[PDB]
Design a protein around this ligand. Sequence first.
Ligand SMILES: Nc1ncnc2c1ncn2[C@@H]1O[C@H](COP(=O)(O)OP(=O)(O)OP(=O)(O)O)[C@@H](O)[C@H]1O
Ligand SMILES: [Mg+2]
Lengths: 98, 49, 50, 84, 99
Amino acid sequence: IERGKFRSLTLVNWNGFFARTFDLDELVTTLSGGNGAGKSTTMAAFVTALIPDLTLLHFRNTTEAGATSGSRDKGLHGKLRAGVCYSTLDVINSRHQR
Amino acid sequence: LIPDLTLLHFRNTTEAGATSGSRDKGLHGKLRAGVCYSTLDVINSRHQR
Amino acid sequence: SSKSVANIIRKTIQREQNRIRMLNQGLQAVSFGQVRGVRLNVNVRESHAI
Amino acid sequence: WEEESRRLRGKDISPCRLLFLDQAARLDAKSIATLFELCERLQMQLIIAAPENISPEKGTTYKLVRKVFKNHEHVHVVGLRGFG
Amino acid sequence: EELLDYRNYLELDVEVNRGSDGWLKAESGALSTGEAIGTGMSILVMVVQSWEEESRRLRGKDISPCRLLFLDQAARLDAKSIATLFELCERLQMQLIIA
Ligand SMILES: Nc1ncnc2c1ncn2[C@@H]1O[C@H](COP(=O)(O)OP(=O)(O)OP(=O)(O)O)[C@@H](O)[C@H]1O
Ligand SMILES: [Mg+2]
């Protein structure tokens, strides 16, 4: 059977990204750039698209991963710009449905 | 630098602040059977070695 | 004695603020990602100032 | 999890597979090659991040650069290729 | 007893001049890995300098204690951040062990 795949990830009005669509790879997609480029932002946006449960979403730094920082902020709000924002996934199903 | 068994905890870089999980501090397995040594050499402002 | 205690607290607070402000000068213009400067902000809490 | 849900799901659908790895620079070349071979053997998609391009000859790659621009920020994305 | 200590009378915060924006309170959740690591090193050198200043008056006038710090998994930082860290350590005559 042909397993479904994640074609692309689209980010709208995000912090730094206005409307950017990264076309994902069949096996591996890599993101590079100096510190603060916004890779972690892309990961966070994806996972938000996957599990929009607001209680769970907590974007701690890679440092203090699971160490309580007492910031009281999940970090998602500062990753979005004012106004509307979108985070979407295109998936090709094993039934070849987009 | 700090030869205190209470404080020395060589947890993995991952889980840098997370709970112990296990009871070992991770130091024993870094040693070998027998007598071992860890030494620093310092030159003061007075230049005493 | 109470007046002296208050004055010594004030003097120590001023001295520590000055020392921290002095130290802060060395961290000016540090380029880290989008970070360009670091400061240690020291203040006197109102609940204790009063 | 996939195996357990094999009954409820239809016989014609295989669920998508995808994982992440931030700060990939903590892994060396050998470890990353092993991870790649494992993921491809398991048909597992991976999204990895590292300040330096640690996987130049496999999958797709992007490079992001953040520019201050008229008192706000913009991220510019450029594709990368193994050979030139 | 908490009130009896002068330090408690002081509020201390860490602020960063992040990008186009002004000085913002340093929240671990509102920064990238490299930014947090760099701010941590900055505060650590601040602490070391403060400790040396405090201890000087109880030491020989011609004693300068050694300063040495670590950085494991340094690969999380880019070349620019590493160069800035090296510049900082040199300016502070501070030894680094980076993995
Ligand atoms: N919630 C937030 N509030 C404010 N600024 C944020 C927030 N989230 C991210 N930023 C800033 O956005 C920029 C990108 O952050 P991000 O963590 O996504 O970068 P990155 O590419 O993953 O970085 P690194 O590889 O160094 O960890 C950085 O300047 C970060 O400080
Ligand atoms: Mg990151």
